[PDB]
CSV table of N, CA and C and ligand atoms in Angstrom, one decimal:
chain,number,residue,atom,x,y,z
A,1,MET,N,260.2,113.9,85.1
A,1,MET,CA,261.3,113.8,86.2
A,1,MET,C,262.2,112.6,85.9
A,2,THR,N,262.7,112.1,87.0
A,2,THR,CA,263.7,111.0,86.9
A,2,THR,C,263.0,109.6,86.6
A,3,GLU,N,263.5,108.9,85.6
A,3,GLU,CA,262.9,107.6,85.3
A,3,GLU,C,263.9,106.5,85.7
A,4,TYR,N,263.3,105.5,86.3
A,4,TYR,CA,264.1,104.3,86.7
A,4,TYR,C,263.6,103.1,86.1
A,5,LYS,N,264.5,102.4,85.3
A,5,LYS,CA,264.1,101.2,84.6
A,5,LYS,C,264.5,100.0,85.4
A,6,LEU,N,263.5,99.3,86.0
A,6,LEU,CA,263.7,98.2,86.8
A,6,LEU,C,263.4,96.9,86.1
A,7,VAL,N,264.1,95.8,86.4
A,7,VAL,CA,263.8,94.5,85.7
A,7,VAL,C,263.7,93.5,86.8
A,8,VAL,N,262.7,92.6,86.8
A,8,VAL,CA,262.5,91.6,87.7
A,8,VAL,C,262.8,90.2,87.1
A,9,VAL,N,263.8,89.5,87.6
A,9,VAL,CA,264.2,88.2,87.0
A,9,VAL,C,264.2,87.1,88.1
A,10,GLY,N,264.2,85.9,87.7
A,10,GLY,CA,264.2,84.8,88.6
A,10,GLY,C,263.5,83.6,88.0
A,11,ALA,N,263.7,82.4,88.6
A,11,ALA,CA,263.1,81.2,88.1
A,11,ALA,C,261.5,81.2,88.0
A,12,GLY,N,261.0,80.4,87.2
A,12,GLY,CA,259.5,80.3,87.0
A,12,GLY,C,258.8,80.1,88.3
A,13,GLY,N,257.7,80.8,88.4
A,13,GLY,CA,256.9,80.6,89.6
A,13,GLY,C,257.3,81.2,90.9
A,14,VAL,N,258.5,81.9,91.0
A,14,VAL,CA,258.9,82.5,92.2
A,14,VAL,C,258.1,83.7,92.7
A,15,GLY,N,257.3,84.2,91.8
A,15,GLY,CA,256.5,85.4,92.2
A,15,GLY,C,256.8,86.7,91.6
A,16,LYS,N,257.6,86.7,90.5
A,16,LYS,CA,257.9,88.0,89.9
A,16,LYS,C,256.7,88.8,89.5
A,17,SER,N,255.8,88.2,88.8
A,17,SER,CA,254.6,89.0,88.4
A,17,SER,C,253.8,89.4,89.6
A,18,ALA,N,253.5,88.5,90.6
A,18,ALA,CA,252.8,88.8,91.8
A,18,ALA,C,253.4,90.0,92.5
A,19,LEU,N,254.7,90.0,92.6
A,19,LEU,CA,255.4,91.1,93.3
A,19,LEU,C,255.2,92.4,92.6
A,20,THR,N,255.4,92.4,91.2
A,20,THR,CA,255.2,93.6,90.4
A,20,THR,C,253.8,94.2,90.5
A,21,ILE,N,252.9,93.3,90.3
A,21,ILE,CA,251.4,93.7,90.3
A,21,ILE,C,251.0,94.2,91.7
A,22,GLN,N,251.5,93.6,92.7
A,22,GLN,CA,251.2,94.1,94.1
A,22,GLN,C,251.7,95.5,94.2
A,23,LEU,N,252.9,95.7,93.8
A,23,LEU,CA,253.5,97.1,93.9
A,23,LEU,C,252.7,98.1,93.1
A,24,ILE,N,252.5,97.8,91.8
A,24,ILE,CA,251.8,98.7,90.9
A,24,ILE,C,250.3,98.8,91.0
A,25,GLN,N,249.6,97.6,91.2
A,25,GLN,CA,248.2,97.6,91.2
A,25,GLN,C,247.5,97.3,92.5
A,26,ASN,N,248.4,97.0,93.5
A,26,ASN,CA,247.9,96.8,94.9
A,26,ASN,C,246.9,95.6,95.1
A,27,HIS,N,247.2,94.5,94.5
A,27,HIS,CA,246.3,93.3,94.7
A,27,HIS,C,247.2,92.1,94.5
A,28,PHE,N,246.8,91.0,95.1
A,28,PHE,CA,247.6,89.7,94.9
A,28,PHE,C,247.0,88.8,93.9
A,29,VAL,N,247.8,88.4,92.9
A,29,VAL,CA,247.4,87.5,91.8
A,29,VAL,C,247.6,86.1,92.4
A,30,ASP,N,246.5,85.4,92.6
A,30,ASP,CA,246.5,84.1,93.1
A,30,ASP,C,246.8,83.0,92.1
A,31,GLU,N,246.4,83.2,90.9
A,31,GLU,CA,246.6,82.2,89.9
A,31,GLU,C,248.0,82.3,89.3
A,32,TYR,N,248.4,81.3,88.5
A,32,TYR,CA,249.7,81.2,87.9
A,32,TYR,C,249.6,81.2,86.4
A,33,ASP,N,249.8,82.4,85.8
A,33,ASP,CA,249.8,82.5,84.3
A,33,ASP,C,251.3,82.9,84.0
A,34,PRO,N,252.0,81.9,83.4
A,34,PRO,CA,253.4,82.2,83.0
A,34,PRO,C,253.5,83.4,82.1
A,35,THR,N,254.5,84.2,82.4
A,35,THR,CA,254.8,85.4,81.7
A,35,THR,C,255.8,85.3,80.6
A,36,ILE,N,255.6,86.1,79.5
A,36,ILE,CA,256.5,86.1,78.4
A,36,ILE,C,257.4,87.3,78.7
A,37,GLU,N,256.8,88.5,78.5
A,37,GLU,CA,257.5,89.7,78.8
A,37,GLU,C,256.5,90.9,79.0
A,38,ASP,N,256.3,91.4,80.2
A,38,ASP,CA,255.3,92.5,80.4
A,38,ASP,C,256.0,93.7,81.1
A,39,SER,N,255.5,94.8,80.8
A,39,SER,CA,256.1,96.0,81.4
A,39,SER,C,255.0,96.9,82.1
A,40,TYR,N,255.4,97.5,83.2
A,40,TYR,CA,254.5,98.4,83.9
A,40,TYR,C,255.1,99.7,84.1
A,41,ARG,N,254.3,100.8,84.2
A,41,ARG,CA,254.9,102.1,84.4
A,41,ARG,C,254.0,102.8,85.5
A,42,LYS,N,254.6,103.5,86.4
A,42,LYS,CA,253.9,104.2,87.4
A,42,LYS,C,254.7,105.3,88.1
A,43,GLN,N,254.1,106.5,88.3
A,43,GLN,CA,254.8,107.6,88.9
A,43,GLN,C,254.6,107.5,90.4
A,44,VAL,N,255.7,107.5,91.1
A,44,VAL,CA,255.7,107.4,92.6
A,44,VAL,C,256.7,108.4,93.2
A,45,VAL,N,256.5,108.8,94.4
A,45,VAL,CA,257.4,109.6,95.1
A,45,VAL,C,258.3,108.8,96.0
A,46,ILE,N,259.6,108.8,95.8
A,46,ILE,CA,260.5,108.0,96.6
A,46,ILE,C,261.5,109.0,97.3
A,47,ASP,N,261.5,109.0,98.6
A,47,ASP,CA,262.4,109.9,99.3
A,47,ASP,C,262.3,111.3,98.8
A,48,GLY,N,261.0,111.8,98.7
A,48,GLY,CA,260.8,113.2,98.2
A,48,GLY,C,261.0,113.4,96.7
A,49,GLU,N,261.5,112.4,96.0
A,49,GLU,CA,261.6,112.6,94.6
A,49,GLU,C,260.5,112.0,93.7
A,50,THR,N,259.9,112.8,92.9
A,50,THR,CA,258.8,112.3,92.1
A,50,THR,C,259.5,111.6,90.9
A,51,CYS,N,259.3,110.2,90.8
A,51,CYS,CA,260.0,109.5,89.7
A,51,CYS,C,259.1,108.5,89.0
A,52,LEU,N,259.5,108.2,87.8
A,52,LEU,CA,258.7,107.3,86.9
A,52,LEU,C,259.4,105.9,87.0
A,53,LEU,N,258.7,104.9,87.4
A,53,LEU,CA,259.2,103.6,87.5
A,53,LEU,C,258.7,102.8,86.3
A,54,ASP,N,259.7,102.2,85.5
A,54,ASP,CA,259.3,101.4,84.4
A,54,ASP,C,259.8,100.0,84.8
A,55,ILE,N,258.9,99.1,85.1
A,55,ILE,CA,259.2,97.8,85.5
A,55,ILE,C,259.0,96.7,84.5
A,56,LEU,N,260.0,96.0,84.1
A,56,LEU,CA,259.9,94.9,83.2
A,56,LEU,C,259.8,93.6,83.9
A,57,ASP,N,258.7,92.9,83.7
A,57,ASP,CA,258.4,91.6,84.3
A,57,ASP,C,258.8,90.6,83.3
A,58,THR,N,259.8,89.9,83.6
A,58,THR,CA,260.4,88.8,82.6
A,58,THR,C,259.9,87.4,82.9
A,59,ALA,N,260.1,86.5,82.0
A,59,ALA,CA,259.8,85.1,82.1
A,59,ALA,C,260.8,84.4,82.9
A,60,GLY,N,260.3,83.4,83.7
A,60,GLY,CA,261.2,82.6,84.5
A,60,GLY,C,261.4,81.3,83.8
A,61,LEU,N,260.3,80.9,83.0
A,61,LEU,CA,260.4,79.6,82.3
A,61,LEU,C,261.1,79.8,80.9
A,62,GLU,N,262.0,78.8,80.7
A,62,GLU,CA,262.9,78.8,79.5
A,62,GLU,C,262.0,78.9,78.3
A,63,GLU,N,260.8,78.2,78.3
A,63,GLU,CA,259.9,78.1,77.2
A,63,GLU,C,259.4,79.5,76.8
A,64,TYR,N,259.3,80.4,77.7
A,64,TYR,CA,258.7,81.7,77.4
A,64,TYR,C,259.9,82.8,77.4
A,65,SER,N,261.1,82.4,77.6
A,65,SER,CA,262.2,83.3,77.7
A,65,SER,C,262.9,83.6,76.3
A,66,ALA,N,262.1,84.0,75.4
A,66,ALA,CA,262.5,84.3,74.0
A,66,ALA,C,263.7,85.3,74.0
A,67,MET,N,263.5,86.5,73.3
A,67,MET,CA,264.5,87.5,73.3
A,67,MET,C,264.6,88.3,74.6
A,68,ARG,N,264.5,87.5,75.7
A,68,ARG,CA,264.5,88.1,77.0
A,68,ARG,C,265.8,89.0,77.2
A,69,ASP,N,266.9,88.6,76.7
A,69,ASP,CA,268.1,89.3,76.8
A,69,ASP,C,268.0,90.7,76.3
A,70,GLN,N,267.3,90.9,75.2
A,70,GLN,CA,267.1,92.2,74.6
A,70,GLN,C,266.3,93.1,75.4
A,71,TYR,N,265.2,92.6,76.0
A,71,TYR,CA,264.3,93.4,76.9
A,71,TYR,C,265.1,94.0,78.1
A,72,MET,N,265.9,93.1,78.7
A,72,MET,CA,266.6,93.5,79.9
A,72,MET,C,267.8,94.5,79.6
A,73,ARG,N,268.2,94.6,78.4
A,73,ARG,CA,269.3,95.5,78.0
A,73,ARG,C,269.3,96.9,78.6
A,74,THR,N,268.2,97.6,78.6
A,74,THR,CA,268.1,98.9,79.1
A,74,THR,C,267.9,99.0,80.6
A,75,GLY,N,267.7,97.8,81.2
A,75,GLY,CA,267.5,97.8,82.6
A,75,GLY,C,268.6,98.5,83.4
A,76,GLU,N,268.3,99.3,84.4
A,76,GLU,CA,269.2,100.0,85.2
A,76,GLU,C,269.4,99.3,86.5
A,77,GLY,N,268.4,98.6,87.0
A,77,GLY,CA,268.5,97.9,88.2
A,77,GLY,C,267.7,96.6,88.1
A,78,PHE,N,268.2,95.6,88.9
A,78,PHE,CA,267.5,94.3,88.8
A,78,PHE,C,267.2,93.7,90.1
A,79,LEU,N,266.0,93.1,90.2
A,79,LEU,CA,265.6,92.4,91.4
A,79,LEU,C,265.8,90.9,91.0
A,80,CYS,N,266.6,90.2,91.8
A,80,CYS,CA,266.9,88.8,91.5
A,80,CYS,C,266.1,88.0,92.6
A,81,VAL,N,265.0,87.4,92.1
A,81,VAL,CA,264.0,86.8,93.0
A,81,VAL,C,264.0,85.3,93.0
A,82,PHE,N,264.0,84.7,94.2
A,82,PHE,CA,263.9,83.3,94.4
A,82,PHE,C,262.8,83.1,95.4
A,83,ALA,N,262.3,81.9,95.7
A,83,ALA,CA,261.2,81.7,96.6
A,83,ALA,C,261.8,80.9,97.8
A,84,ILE,N,261.5,81.4,99.0
A,84,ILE,CA,262.1,80.8,100.2
A,84,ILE,C,261.7,79.3,100.4
A,85,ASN,N,260.7,78.9,99.6
A,85,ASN,CA,260.2,77.5,99.7
A,85,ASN,C,260.6,76.7,98.5
A,86,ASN,N,261.6,77.2,97.8
A,86,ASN,CA,262.1,76.6,96.5
A,86,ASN,C,263.6,76.7,96.5
A,87,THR,N,264.3,75.7,97.1
A,87,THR,CA,265.7,75.6,97.1
A,87,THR,C,266.4,75.8,95.8
A,88,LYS,N,265.8,75.1,94.8
A,88,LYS,CA,266.4,75.2,93.4
A,88,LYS,C,266.4,76.6,92.9
A,89,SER,N,265.3,77.3,93.1
A,89,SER,CA,265.3,78.7,92.6
A,89,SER,C,266.4,79.6,93.2
A,90,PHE,N,266.8,79.3,94.5
A,90,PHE,CA,267.8,80.0,95.2
A,90,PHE,C,269.2,79.6,94.6
A,91,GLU,N,269.4,78.3,94.4
A,91,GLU,CA,270.6,77.7,93.8
A,91,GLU,C,270.8,78.3,92.4
A,92,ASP,N,269.7,78.6,91.7
A,92,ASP,CA,269.9,79.1,90.3
A,92,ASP,C,270.0,80.6,90.1
A,93,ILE,N,270.1,81.3,91.3
A,93,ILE,CA,270.2,82.7,91.2
A,93,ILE,C,271.5,83.1,90.4
A,94,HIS,N,272.5,82.3,90.5
A,94,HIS,CA,273.8,82.6,89.8
A,94,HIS,C,273.6,82.7,88.2
A,95,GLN,N,272.6,82.0,87.7
A,95,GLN,CA,272.3,82.0,86.3
A,95,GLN,C,271.8,83.4,85.9
A,96,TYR,N,270.9,84.0,86.7
A,96,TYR,CA,270.4,85.3,86.4
A,96,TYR,C,271.5,86.4,86.6
A,97,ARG,N,272.4,86.2,87.6
A,97,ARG,CA,273.5,87.1,87.8
A,97,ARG,C,274.3,87.1,86.6
A,98,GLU,N,274.6,86.0,86.0
A,98,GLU,CA,275.4,85.8,84.8
A,98,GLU,C,274.8,86.5,83.6
A,99,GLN,N,273.5,86.3,83.5
A,99,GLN,CA,272.7,86.8,82.4
A,99,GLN,C,272.8,88.4,82.4
A,100,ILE,N,272.6,88.9,83.6
A,100,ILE,CA,272.6,90.4,83.8
A,100,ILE,C,274.0,90.9,83.4
A,101,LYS,N,275.0,90.2,83.9
A,101,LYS,CA,276.4,90.6,83.6
A,101,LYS,C,276.6,90.7,82.1
A,102,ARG,N,276.1,89.7,81.3
A,102,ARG,CA,276.2,89.7,79.9
A,102,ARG,C,275.4,90.8,79.2
A,103,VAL,N,274.1,91.0,79.6
A,103,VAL,CA,273.3,92.0,79.0
A,103,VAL,C,273.8,93.4,79.2
A,104,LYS,N,274.4,93.6,80.4
A,104,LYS,CA,274.9,94.9,80.8
A,104,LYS,C,276.4,95.1,80.6
A,105,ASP,N,277.1,93.9,80.4
A,105,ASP,CA,278.5,94.0,80.2
A,105,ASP,C,279.2,94.7,81.3
A,106,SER,N,278.8,94.4,82.5
A,106,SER,CA,279.3,95.0,83.7
A,106,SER,C,279.2,94.1,85.0
A,107,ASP,N,280.1,94.3,85.9
A,107,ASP,CA,280.2,93.6,87.1
A,107,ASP,C,279.6,94.4,88.3
A,108,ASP,N,279.3,95.7,88.0
A,108,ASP,CA,278.7,96.6,88.9
A,108,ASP,C,277.3,97.1,88.5
A,109,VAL,N,276.3,96.2,88.6
A,109,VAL,CA,275.0,96.5,88.2
A,109,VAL,C,274.1,96.6,89.4
A,110,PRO,N,273.3,97.7,89.6
A,110,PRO,CA,272.4,97.8,90.8
A,110,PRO,C,271.5,96.6,90.9
A,111,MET,N,271.5,96.0,92.1
A,111,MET,CA,270.7,94.8,92.3
A,111,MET,C,270.3,94.6,93.7
A,112,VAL,N,269.3,93.7,93.9
A,112,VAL,CA,268.7,93.4,95.2
A,112,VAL,C,268.3,91.9,95.2
A,113,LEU,N,268.7,91.1,96.1
A,113,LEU,CA,268.4,89.7,96.2
A,113,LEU,C,267.0,89.7,97.0
A,114,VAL,N,266.0,89.1,96.4
A,114,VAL,CA,264.7,89.0,97.0
A,114,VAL,C,264.3,87.6,97.3
A,115,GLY,N,264.0,87.3,98.6
A,115,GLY,CA,263.5,86.0,99.0
A,115,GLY,C,262.0,86.2,99.1
A,116,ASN,N,261.2,85.8,98.1
A,116,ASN,CA,259.8,85.9,98.1
A,116,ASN,C,259.0,84.8,98.7
A,117,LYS,N,257.7,85.0,98.9
A,117,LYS,CA,256.8,84.0,99.5
A,117,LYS,C,257.1,83.8,101.0
A,118,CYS,N,257.6,84.8,101.7
A,118,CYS,CA,258.0,84.7,103.1
A,118,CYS,C,256.8,84.4,104.0
A,119,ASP,N,255.6,84.4,103.4
A,119,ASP,CA,254.4,84.1,104.2
A,119,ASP,C,254.2,82.6,104.3
A,120,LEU,N,254.8,81.9,103.4
A,120,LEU,CA,254.7,80.4,103.4
A,120,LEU,C,255.6,79.8,104.5
A,121,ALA,N,255.1,78.6,105.0
A,121,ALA,CA,255.8,77.9,106.1
A,121,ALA,C,256.8,76.8,105.7
A,122,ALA,N,256.7,76.4,104.5
A,122,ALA,CA,257.6,75.3,104.0
A,122,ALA,C,258.9,75.9,103.6
A,123,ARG,N,259.6,76.6,104.5
A,123,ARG,CA,260.8,77.3,104.2
A,123,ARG,C,262.0,76.3,104.1
A,124,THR,N,262.8,76.4,103.1
A,124,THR,CA,264.0,75.5,102.9
A,124,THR,C,265.2,76.4,102.7
A,125,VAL,N,265.0,77.7,102.5
A,125,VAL,CA,266.1,78.6,102.3
A,125,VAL,C,266.0,79.5,103.6
A,126,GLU,N,267.0,79.4,104.5
A,126,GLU,CA,267.0,80.2,105.7
A,126,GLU,C,267.5,81.6,105.3
A,127,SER,N,267.0,82.6,106.0
A,127,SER,CA,267.4,84.0,105.8
A,127,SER,C,269.0,84.1,105.8
A,128,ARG,N,269.6,83.5,106.7
A,128,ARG,CA,271.1,83.6,106.9
A,128,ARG,C,271.8,83.1,105.6
A,129,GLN,N,271.3,82.0,105.0
A,129,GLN,CA,271.8,81.5,103.8
A,129,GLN,C,271.8,82.5,102.6
A,130,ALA,N,270.6,83.2,102.5
A,130,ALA,CA,270.4,84.2,101.5
A,130,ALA,C,271.3,85.4,101.8
A,131,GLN,N,271.4,85.8,103.1
A,131,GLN,CA,272.2,86.9,103.5
A,131,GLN,C,273.6,86.7,103.0
A,132,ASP,N,274.1,85.5,103.2
A,132,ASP,CA,275.5,85.2,102.8
A,132,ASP,C,275.7,85.3,101.3
A,133,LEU,N,274.7,84.9,100.5
A,133,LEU,CA,274.8,85.0,99.0
A,133,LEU,C,274.8,86.5,98.7
A,134,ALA,N,273.9,87.3,99.2
A,134,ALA,CA,273.8,88.7,98.9
A,134,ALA,C,275.1,89.4,99.3
A,135,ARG,N,275.6,89.1,100.5
A,135,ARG,CA,276.9,89.7,100.9
A,135,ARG,C,278.0,89.4,99.9
A,136,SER,N,278.0,88.2,99.3
A,136,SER,CA,279.1,87.9,98.4
A,136,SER,C,278.9,88.7,97.1
A,137,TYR,N,277.7,89.2,96.8
A,137,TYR,CA,277.5,90.0,95.6
A,137,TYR,C,277.6,91.5,96.0
A,138,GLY,N,277.6,91.7,97.3
A,138,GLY,CA,277.7,93.1,97.8
A,138,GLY,C,276.4,93.8,97.6
A,139,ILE,N,275.3,93.1,97.7
A,139,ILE,CA,274.0,93.7,97.5
A,139,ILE,C,273.1,93.4,98.7
A,140,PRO,N,272.0,94.1,98.9
A,140,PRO,CA,271.0,93.9,100.0
A,140,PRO,C,270.2,92.6,99.8
A,141,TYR,N,269.8,92.0,100.9
A,141,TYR,CA,268.9,90.8,100.8
A,141,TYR,C,267.6,91.3,101.5
A,142,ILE,N,266.5,91.1,100.8
A,142,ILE,CA,265.2,91.5,101.4
A,142,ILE,C,264.2,90.4,101.1
A,143,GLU,N,263.4,90.0,102.2
A,143,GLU,CA,262.4,89.0,102.0
A,143,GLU,C,261.1,89.7,101.8
A,144,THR,N,260.3,89.1,100.9
A,144,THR,CA,259.0,89.7,100.5
A,144,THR,C,257.9,88.7,100.5
A,145,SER,N,256.7,89.2,100.4
A,145,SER,CA,255.5,88.4,100.2
A,145,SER,C,254.5,89.2,99.3
A,146,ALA,N,254.3,88.7,98.1
A,146,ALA,CA,253.4,89.4,97.2
A,146,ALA,C,252.0,89.2,97.7
A,147,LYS,N,251.8,88.2,98.6
A,147,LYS,CA,250.5,87.9,99.1
A,147,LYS,C,250.1,88.9,100.3
A,148,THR,N,251.0,89.1,101.2
A,148,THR,CA,250.7,90.0,102.3
A,148,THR,C,251.2,91.5,102.1
A,149,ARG,N,252.0,91.6,101.1
A,149,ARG,CA,252.6,92.9,100.7
A,149,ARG,C,253.9,93.2,101.6
A,150,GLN,N,254.2,92.3,102.5
A,150,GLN,CA,255.4,92.5,103.3
A,150,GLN,C,256.7,92.7,102.5
A,151,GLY,N,257.4,93.7,102.8
A,151,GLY,CA,258.7,94.0,102.1
A,151,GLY,C,258.6,94.3,100.6
A,152,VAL,N,257.4,94.3,100.1
A,152,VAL,CA,257.3,94.6,98.6
A,152,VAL,C,257.8,96.0,98.2
A,153,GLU,N,257.3,97.1,98.8
A,153,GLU,CA,257.7,98.4,98.5
A,153,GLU,C,259.2,98.6,98.9
A,154,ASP,N,259.6,98.0,100.0
A,154,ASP,CA,261.0,98.1,100.5
A,154,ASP,C,261.9,97.5,99.4
A,155,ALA,N,261.6,96.4,98.8
A,155,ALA,CA,262.4,95.7,97.8
A,155,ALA,C,262.6,96.6,96.6
A,156,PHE,N,261.5,97.1,96.0
A,156,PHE,CA,261.6,98.0,94.8
A,156,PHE,C,262.2,99.3,95.1
A,157,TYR,N,261.9,99.9,96.3
A,157,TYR,CA,262.5,101.2,96.6
A,157,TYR,C,263.9,101.1,96.9
A,158,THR,N,264.3,100.0,97.6
A,158,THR,CA,265.7,99.8,97.9
A,158,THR,C,266.5,99.7,96.6
A,159,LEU,N,265.9,99.1,95.6
A,159,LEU,CA,266.6,98.9,94.3
A,159,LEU,C,266.8,100.3,93.7
A,160,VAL,N,265.8,101.2,93.8
A,160,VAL,CA,266.0,102.6,93.3
A,160,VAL,C,267.1,103.2,94.0
A,161,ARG,N,267.2,103.1,95.4
A,161,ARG,CA,268.2,103.7,96.2
A,161,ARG,C,269.6,103.1,95.8
A,162,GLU,N,269.6,101.8,95.3
A,162,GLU,CA,270.9,101.2,94.9
A,162,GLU,C,271.3,101.8,93.6
A,163,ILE,N,270.4,102.1,92.7
A,163,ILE,CA,270.7,102.7,91.5
A,163,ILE,C,271.3,104.1,91.7
A,164,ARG,N,270.7,104.8,92.7
A,164,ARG,CA,271.2,106.1,93.1
A,164,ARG,C,272.6,106.1,93.6
A,165,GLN,N,273.0,105.0,94.2
A,165,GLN,CA,274.4,104.9,94.8
A,165,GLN,C,275.3,104.6,93.6
A,166,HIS,N,274.8,104.2,92.5
A,166,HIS,CA,275.5,103.8,91.3
A,166,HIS,C,276.0,105.1,90.6
B,1,LIG,N1,251.8,82.4,99.2
B,1,LIG,C1,252.4,83.1,98.2
B,1,LIG,N2,252.2,82.8,96.9
B,1,LIG,C2,252.9,83.6,96.0
B,1,LIG,C3,253.7,84.7,96.3
B,1,LIG,N3,254.2,85.3,95.1
B,1,LIG,C4,253.6,84.6,94.2
B,1,LIG,N4,252.8,83.5,94.7
B,1,LIG,C5,252.1,82.5,93.9
B,1,LIG,O1,253.0,81.8,93.1
B,1,LIG,C6,252.5,81.5,91.8
B,1,LIG,C7,253.4,82.0,90.7
B,1,LIG,O2,253.5,83.5,90.9
B,1,LIG,P1,253.9,84.4,89.6
B,1,LIG,O3,254.0,85.8,90.2
B,1,LIG,O4,253.0,84.1,88.5
B,1,LIG,O5,255.4,83.8,89.4
B,1,LIG,P2,256.4,84.2,88.2
B,1,LIG,O6,257.7,84.3,88.8
B,1,LIG,O7,255.9,85.5,87.8
B,1,LIG,N5,256.2,83.0,87.1
B,1,LIG,P3,256.7,83.1,85.5
B,1,LIG,O8,258.2,83.3,85.5
B,1,LIG,O9,256.4,81.9,84.8
B,1,LIG,O10,256.3,84.3,84.8
B,1,LIG,C8,251.1,82.1,91.8
B,1,LIG,O11,250.0,81.1,92.1
B,1,LIG,C9,251.1,83.2,92.9
B,1,LIG,O12,249.9,83.4,93.5
B,1,LIG,C10,253.9,85.1,97.7
B,1,LIG,O13,254.6,86.0,98.2
B,1,LIG,N6,253.2,84.2,98.6
B,2,LIG,CA1,244.7,82.5,84.1
B,3,LIG,MG1,255.5,86.0,85.8
B,4,LIG,MG1,269.0,73.6,104.9
């Protein structure tokens, strides 16, 4: 059936792996093992359509960000993740936006801005601030929690729906 190539990007430790693993394997990864480049595949029915999701979990740490550009090349949609308790991760979203533009050589790439770790109380990035950023890119802003699963499916499914509008 239809295959959707999704790519998760964002600063180190924002929760890219936890989000992906919660979506695909249904459990929360409590420990922090820096990622180099991992891929996941799973058949799911979205809006009545049986589709194959190929999700690339990329490195947020520069030290593990080797040929990251090459892996992302085939990506059809991207989740740009920051953590609501990490202001710097939010401020650096533009870096990932720029990288995506380069790898895809396009200004119109399906995307979703994700504010992860919404279960944490030390929030320094208010929803409104993220909504303004997303609005400027013309993309949806969705908050998630890889820990409680809140907004997790919504984030990935919305990305599929954005690819469909593409
Ligand atoms: N409370 C809470 N902790 C989270 C959440 N998502 C991730 N974490 C925690 O944050 C740490 C880093 O998460 P991880 O998914 O490894 O981040 P990453 O973005 O994949 N890191 P890297 O880019 O180096 O590969 C882990 O200890 C993980 O449990 C969340 O929604 N809530
Ligand atoms: Ca470990
Ligand atoms: Mg990771
Ligand atoms: Mg403030």
